[PDB]
Coordinates of C-alpha atoms and ligand atoms in Angstrom, one line a residue:
X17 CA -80.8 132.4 103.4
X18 CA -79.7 130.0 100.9
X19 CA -77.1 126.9 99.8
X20 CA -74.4 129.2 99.6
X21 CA -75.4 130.8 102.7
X22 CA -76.0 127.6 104.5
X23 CA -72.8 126.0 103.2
X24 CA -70.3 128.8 104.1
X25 CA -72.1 129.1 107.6
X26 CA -70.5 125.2 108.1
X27 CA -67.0 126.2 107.1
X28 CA -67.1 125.1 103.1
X29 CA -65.9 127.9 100.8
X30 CA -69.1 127.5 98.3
X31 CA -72.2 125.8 97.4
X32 CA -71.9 126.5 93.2
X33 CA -73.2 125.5 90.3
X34 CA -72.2 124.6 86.7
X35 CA -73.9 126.6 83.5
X36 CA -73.2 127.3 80.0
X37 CA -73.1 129.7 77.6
X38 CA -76.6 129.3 75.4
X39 CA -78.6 129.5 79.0
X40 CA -76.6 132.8 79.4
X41 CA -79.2 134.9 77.8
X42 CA -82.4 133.4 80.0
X43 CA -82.8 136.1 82.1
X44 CA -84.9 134.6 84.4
X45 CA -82.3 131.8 84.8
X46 CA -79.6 134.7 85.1
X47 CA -81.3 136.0 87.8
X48 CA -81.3 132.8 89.8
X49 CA -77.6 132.1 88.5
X50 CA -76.4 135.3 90.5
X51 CA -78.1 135.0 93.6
X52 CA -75.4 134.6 95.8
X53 CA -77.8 133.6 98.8
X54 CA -77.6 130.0 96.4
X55 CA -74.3 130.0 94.4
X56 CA -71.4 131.4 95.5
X57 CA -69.4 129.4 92.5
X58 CA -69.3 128.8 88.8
X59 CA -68.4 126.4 86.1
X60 CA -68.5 126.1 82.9
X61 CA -70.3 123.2 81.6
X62 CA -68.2 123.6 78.3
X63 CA -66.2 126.3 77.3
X64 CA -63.1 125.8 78.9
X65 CA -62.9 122.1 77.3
X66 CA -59.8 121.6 74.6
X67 CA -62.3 121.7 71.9
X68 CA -63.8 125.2 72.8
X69 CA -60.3 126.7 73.5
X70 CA -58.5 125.3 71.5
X71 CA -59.8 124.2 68.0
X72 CA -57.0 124.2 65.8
X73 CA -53.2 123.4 67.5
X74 CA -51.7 126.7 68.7
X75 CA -55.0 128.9 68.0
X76 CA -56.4 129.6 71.3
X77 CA -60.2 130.3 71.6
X78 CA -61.3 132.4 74.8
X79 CA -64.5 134.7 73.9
X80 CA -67.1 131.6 75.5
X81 CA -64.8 130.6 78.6
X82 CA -64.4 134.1 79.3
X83 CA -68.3 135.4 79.1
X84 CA -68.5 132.6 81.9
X85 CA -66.0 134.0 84.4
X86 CA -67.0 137.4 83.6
X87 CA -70.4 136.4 84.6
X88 CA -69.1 135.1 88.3
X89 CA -66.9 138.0 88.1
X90 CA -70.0 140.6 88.0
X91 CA -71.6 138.6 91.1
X92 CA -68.2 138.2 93.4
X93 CA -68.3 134.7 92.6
X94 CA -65.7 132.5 92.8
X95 CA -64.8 129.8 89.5
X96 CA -64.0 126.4 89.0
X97 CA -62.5 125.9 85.5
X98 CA -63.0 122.9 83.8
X99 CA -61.3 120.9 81.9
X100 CA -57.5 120.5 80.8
X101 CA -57.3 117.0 80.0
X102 CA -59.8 114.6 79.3
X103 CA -60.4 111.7 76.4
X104 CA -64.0 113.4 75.3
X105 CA -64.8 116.8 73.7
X106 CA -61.4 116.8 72.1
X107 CA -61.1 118.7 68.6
X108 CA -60.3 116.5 65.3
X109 CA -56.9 117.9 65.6
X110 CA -56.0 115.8 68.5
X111 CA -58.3 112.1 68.1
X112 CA -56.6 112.1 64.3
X113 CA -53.0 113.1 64.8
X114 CA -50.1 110.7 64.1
X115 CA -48.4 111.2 67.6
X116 CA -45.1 110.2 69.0
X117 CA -45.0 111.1 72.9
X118 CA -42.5 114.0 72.0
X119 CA -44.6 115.1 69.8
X120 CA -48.3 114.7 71.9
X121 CA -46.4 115.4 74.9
X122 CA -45.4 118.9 73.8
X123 CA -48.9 119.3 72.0
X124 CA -50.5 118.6 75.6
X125 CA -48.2 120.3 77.4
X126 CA -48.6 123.9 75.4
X127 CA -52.4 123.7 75.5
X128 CA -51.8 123.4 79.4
X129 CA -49.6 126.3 79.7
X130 CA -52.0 128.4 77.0
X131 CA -55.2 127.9 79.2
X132 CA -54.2 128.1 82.1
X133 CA -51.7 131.6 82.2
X134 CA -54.9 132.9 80.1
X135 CA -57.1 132.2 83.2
X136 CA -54.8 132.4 86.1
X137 CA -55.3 134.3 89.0
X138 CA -59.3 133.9 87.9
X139 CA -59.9 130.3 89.3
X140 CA -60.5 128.5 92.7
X141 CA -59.6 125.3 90.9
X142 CA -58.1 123.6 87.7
X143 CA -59.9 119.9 87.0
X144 CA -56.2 119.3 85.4
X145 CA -57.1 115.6 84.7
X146 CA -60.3 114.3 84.4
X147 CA -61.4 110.5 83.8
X148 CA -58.6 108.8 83.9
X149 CA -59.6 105.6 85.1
X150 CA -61.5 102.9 84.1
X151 CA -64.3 101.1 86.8
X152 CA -62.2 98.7 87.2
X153 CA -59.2 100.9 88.4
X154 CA -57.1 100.7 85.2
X155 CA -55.7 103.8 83.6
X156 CA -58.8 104.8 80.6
X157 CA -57.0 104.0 77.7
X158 CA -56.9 107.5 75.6
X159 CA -55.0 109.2 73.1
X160 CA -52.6 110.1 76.2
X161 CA -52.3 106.8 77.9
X162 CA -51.5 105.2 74.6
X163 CA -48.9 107.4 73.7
X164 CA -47.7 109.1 76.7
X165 CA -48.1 106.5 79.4
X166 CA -49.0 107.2 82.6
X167 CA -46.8 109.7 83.4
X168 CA -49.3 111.7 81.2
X169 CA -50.9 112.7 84.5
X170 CA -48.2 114.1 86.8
X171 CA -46.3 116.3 83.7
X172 CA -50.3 117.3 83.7
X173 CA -50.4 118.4 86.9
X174 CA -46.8 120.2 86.7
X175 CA -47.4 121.7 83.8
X176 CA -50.6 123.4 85.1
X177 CA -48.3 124.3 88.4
X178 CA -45.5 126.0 86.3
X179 CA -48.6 128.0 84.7
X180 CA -50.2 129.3 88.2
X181 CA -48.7 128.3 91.2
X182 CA -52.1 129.6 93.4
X183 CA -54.7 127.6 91.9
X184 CA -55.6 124.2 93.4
X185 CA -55.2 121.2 91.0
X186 CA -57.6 118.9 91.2
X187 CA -57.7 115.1 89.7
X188 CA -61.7 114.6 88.4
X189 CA -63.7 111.6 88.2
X190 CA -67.0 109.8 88.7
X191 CA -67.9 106.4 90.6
X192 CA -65.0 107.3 92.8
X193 CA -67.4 108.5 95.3
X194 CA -68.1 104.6 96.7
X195 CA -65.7 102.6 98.4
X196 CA -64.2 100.4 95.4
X197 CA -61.7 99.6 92.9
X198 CA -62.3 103.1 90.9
X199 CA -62.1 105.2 94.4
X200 CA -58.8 103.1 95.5
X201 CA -57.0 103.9 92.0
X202 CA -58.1 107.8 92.6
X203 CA -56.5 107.6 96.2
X204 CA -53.5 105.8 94.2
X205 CA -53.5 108.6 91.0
X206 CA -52.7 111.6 94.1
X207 CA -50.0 109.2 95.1
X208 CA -48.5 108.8 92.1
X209 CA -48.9 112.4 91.1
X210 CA -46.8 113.3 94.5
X211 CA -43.8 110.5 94.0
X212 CA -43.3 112.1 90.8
X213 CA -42.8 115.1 92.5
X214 CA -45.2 117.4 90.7
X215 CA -48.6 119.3 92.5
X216 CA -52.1 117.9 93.6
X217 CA -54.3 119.9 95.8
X218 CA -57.8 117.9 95.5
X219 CA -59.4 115.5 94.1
X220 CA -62.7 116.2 92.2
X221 CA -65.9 113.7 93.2
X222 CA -68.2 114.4 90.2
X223 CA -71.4 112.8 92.2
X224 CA -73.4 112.3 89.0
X225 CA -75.6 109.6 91.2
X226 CA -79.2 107.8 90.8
X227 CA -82.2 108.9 92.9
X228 CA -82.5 105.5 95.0
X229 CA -79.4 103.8 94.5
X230 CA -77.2 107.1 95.8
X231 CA -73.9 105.7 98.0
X232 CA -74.6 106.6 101.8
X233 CA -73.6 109.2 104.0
X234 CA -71.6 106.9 105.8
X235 CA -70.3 105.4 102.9
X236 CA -69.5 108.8 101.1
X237 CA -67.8 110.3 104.2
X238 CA -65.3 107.1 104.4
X239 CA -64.6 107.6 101.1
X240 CA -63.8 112.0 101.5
X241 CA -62.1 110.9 104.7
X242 CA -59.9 108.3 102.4
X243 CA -58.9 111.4 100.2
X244 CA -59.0 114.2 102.7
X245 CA -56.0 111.5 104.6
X246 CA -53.5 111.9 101.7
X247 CA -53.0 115.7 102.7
X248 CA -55.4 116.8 100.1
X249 CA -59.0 118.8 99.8
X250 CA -62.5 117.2 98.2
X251 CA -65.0 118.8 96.7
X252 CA -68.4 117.3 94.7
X253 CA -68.1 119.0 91.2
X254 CA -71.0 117.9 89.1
X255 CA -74.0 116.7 91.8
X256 CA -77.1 115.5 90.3
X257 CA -79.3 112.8 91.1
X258 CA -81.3 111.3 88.0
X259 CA -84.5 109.6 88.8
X260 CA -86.0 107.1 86.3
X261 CA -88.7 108.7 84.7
X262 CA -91.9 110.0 85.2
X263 CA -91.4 112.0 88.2
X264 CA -94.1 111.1 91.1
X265 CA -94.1 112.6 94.6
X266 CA -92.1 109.7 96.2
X267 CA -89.0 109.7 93.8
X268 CA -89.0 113.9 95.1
X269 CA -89.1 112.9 98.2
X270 CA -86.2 109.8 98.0
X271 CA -84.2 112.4 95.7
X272 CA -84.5 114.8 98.9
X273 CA -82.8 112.3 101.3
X274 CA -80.1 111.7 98.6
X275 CA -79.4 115.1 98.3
X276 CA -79.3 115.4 101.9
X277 CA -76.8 112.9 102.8
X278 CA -74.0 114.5 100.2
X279 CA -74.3 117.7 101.7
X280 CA -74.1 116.2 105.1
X281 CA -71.2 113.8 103.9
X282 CA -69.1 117.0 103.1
X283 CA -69.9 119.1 105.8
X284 CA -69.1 115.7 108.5
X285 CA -65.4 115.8 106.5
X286 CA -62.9 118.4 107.1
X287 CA -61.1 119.1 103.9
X288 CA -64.4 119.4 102.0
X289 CA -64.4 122.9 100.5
X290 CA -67.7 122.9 98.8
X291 CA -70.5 121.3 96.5
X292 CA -71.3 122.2 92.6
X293 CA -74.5 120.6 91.3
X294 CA -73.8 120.3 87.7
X295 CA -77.0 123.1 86.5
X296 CA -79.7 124.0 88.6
X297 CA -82.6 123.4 86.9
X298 CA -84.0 120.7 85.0
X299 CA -84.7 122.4 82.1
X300 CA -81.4 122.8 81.3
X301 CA -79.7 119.4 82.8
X302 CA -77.6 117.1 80.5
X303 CA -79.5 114.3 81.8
X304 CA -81.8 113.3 79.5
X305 CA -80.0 113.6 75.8
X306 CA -77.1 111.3 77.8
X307 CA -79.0 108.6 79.8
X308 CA -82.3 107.7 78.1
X309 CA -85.7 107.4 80.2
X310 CA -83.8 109.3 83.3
X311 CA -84.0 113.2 84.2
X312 CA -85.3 115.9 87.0
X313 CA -81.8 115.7 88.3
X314 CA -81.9 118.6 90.0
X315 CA -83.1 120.9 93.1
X316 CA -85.4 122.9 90.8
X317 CA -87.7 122.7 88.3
X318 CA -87.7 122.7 84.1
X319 CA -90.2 126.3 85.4
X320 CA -87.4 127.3 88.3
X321 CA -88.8 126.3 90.9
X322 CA -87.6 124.5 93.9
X323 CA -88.0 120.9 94.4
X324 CA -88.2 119.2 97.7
X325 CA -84.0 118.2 96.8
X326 CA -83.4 122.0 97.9
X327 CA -84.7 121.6 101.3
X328 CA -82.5 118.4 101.5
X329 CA -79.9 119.8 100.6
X330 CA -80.7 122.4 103.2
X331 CA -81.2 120.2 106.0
X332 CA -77.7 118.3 105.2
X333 CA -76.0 121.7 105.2
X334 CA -77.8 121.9 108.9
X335 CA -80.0 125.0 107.7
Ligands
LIG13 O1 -69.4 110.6 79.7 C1 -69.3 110.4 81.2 C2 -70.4 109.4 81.6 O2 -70.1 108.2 81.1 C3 -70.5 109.4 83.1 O3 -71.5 108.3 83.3 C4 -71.6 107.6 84.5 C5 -71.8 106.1 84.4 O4 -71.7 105.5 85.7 C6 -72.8 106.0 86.4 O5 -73.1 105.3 87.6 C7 -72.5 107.5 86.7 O6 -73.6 107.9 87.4 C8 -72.6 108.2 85.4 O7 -72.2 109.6 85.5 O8 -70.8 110.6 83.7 C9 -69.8 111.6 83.3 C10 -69.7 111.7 81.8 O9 -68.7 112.7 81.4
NAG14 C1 -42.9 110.1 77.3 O1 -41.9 110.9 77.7 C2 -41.7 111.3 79.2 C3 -40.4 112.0 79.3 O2 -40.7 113.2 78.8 C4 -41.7 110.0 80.0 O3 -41.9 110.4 81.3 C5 -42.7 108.9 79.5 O4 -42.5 107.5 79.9 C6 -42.7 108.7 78.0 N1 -43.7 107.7 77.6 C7 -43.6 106.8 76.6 C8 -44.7 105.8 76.3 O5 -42.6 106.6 75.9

């Protein structure tokens, strides 16, 4: 009947889909949003960031994250909760503070433990840490890496562990979908995060790729298969597939067989649990106000309606 359908049929828990709170009171996108035949999975494209919850230190914000998970609550759908730590969308508070590592460390460390015993129980997931790295492999130097070090991460990931035991804790990035130096220092990040001793369950690929230069399905698959090896899951958390603009018939159809081969990538790789594309129509994509002269990312249309990317995305789920 659908992505969600078709996806759970091959043994992933979801096919899902990001949103966000302004696009909440579109009732025609609503509609679409909880038809579990599509998306059996929600994130939020921004109210769970440290900004929304928590703009001032130690005064928590939770009316826009929660709106979004009572929203997949009312459908039975499951959540993904995004983000805990992460260099961009952090409030004033943070980017201008004179820090010691005490001092950021415990700062970090309580807005951890806040967000996540407010939501636990109500996520799938945690993206505890999300782009860490830089393309080169190096750790992304942020506030945290500058003060905190390294060990940033794993505390991170313990921290979120103490909070709820049951959710999986997932590392985030992007460009570590392709075998190369960024995907090799994500394979080395759930490493390090395990010989400190603290918690990883998955690692996040955010598959924000181009239409026509989109890593292959054999090329993808090595690359779960390198993660899925290290005794954790995989999931795609932000698929989309920009095409240089205008849109013409033959960029559908190449966006089509790059859609495909994702789906088909993750359903070829035991360990991948599912696939979020990051919105579902074009109309509401971040595309455009981010990389200039690129949009229709995604498997329906700016009008909601479907684009040849849904039927290959169908025919990689084998549907
Ligand atoms: O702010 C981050 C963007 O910088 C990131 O951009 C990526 C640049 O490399 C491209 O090949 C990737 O496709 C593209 O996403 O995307 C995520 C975002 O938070
Ligand atoms: C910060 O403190 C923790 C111990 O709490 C430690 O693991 C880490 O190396 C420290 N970092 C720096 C830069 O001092």
């Amino acid at each position: 009947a659908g992505l969600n359908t078709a996806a759970k049929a091959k043994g992933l828990k979801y096919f899902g889909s990001a949103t966000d709170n302004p696009e909440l009171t579109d009732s025609a996108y609503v509609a679409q949003l909880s038809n579990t035949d599509d998306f059996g999975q929600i994130t939020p494209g921004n109210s769970m960031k440290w900004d929304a919850t928590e703009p001032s230190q130690n005064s928590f914000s939770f009316a826009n994250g929660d709106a979004v998970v009572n929203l997949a609550n009312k459908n039975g759908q499951l959540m993904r909760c995004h983000t805990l730590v992460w260099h961009s969308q952090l409030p004033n508070w943070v980017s201008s503070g004179s820090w010691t590592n005490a001092t950021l460390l415990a700062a970090m460390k309580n807005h951890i433990t806040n967000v996540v015993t407010h939501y636990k129980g109500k996520c799938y997931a945690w993206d505890v840490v999300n782009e860490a790295l830089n393309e080169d492999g190096t750790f992304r130097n942020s506030v945290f890496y500058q003060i905190i070090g390294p060990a940033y991460i794993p505390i991170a990931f313990a921290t979120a562990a103490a909070a709820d035991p049951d959710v999986k804790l997932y590392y985030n990035d992007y460009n570590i979908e392709y075998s190369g130096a960024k995907a090799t220092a994500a394979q080395n990040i759930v490493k390090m995060i395990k010989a400190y001793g603290a918690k990883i369950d998955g690692v996040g690929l955010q598959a924000h790729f181009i239409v026509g230069s989109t890593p292959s399905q054999s090329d993808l698959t090595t690359v779960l298969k390198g993660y899925t090896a290290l005794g954790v899951e995989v999931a795609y958390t932000e698929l989309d597939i920009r095409m240089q603009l205008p849109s013409t018939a033959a960029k559908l159809a190449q966006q089509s067989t790059d859609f495909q081969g994702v789906a088909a990538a993750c359903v070829s790789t035991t360990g991948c649990v599912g696939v979020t594309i990051w919105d579902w129509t074009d109309k509401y994509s971040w595309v455009p106000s981010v990389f200039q002269g690129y949009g229709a990312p995604l498997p329906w249309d700016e009008n909601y309606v479907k684009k040849p990317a849904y039927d290959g995305l169908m025919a990689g789920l084998g549907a």
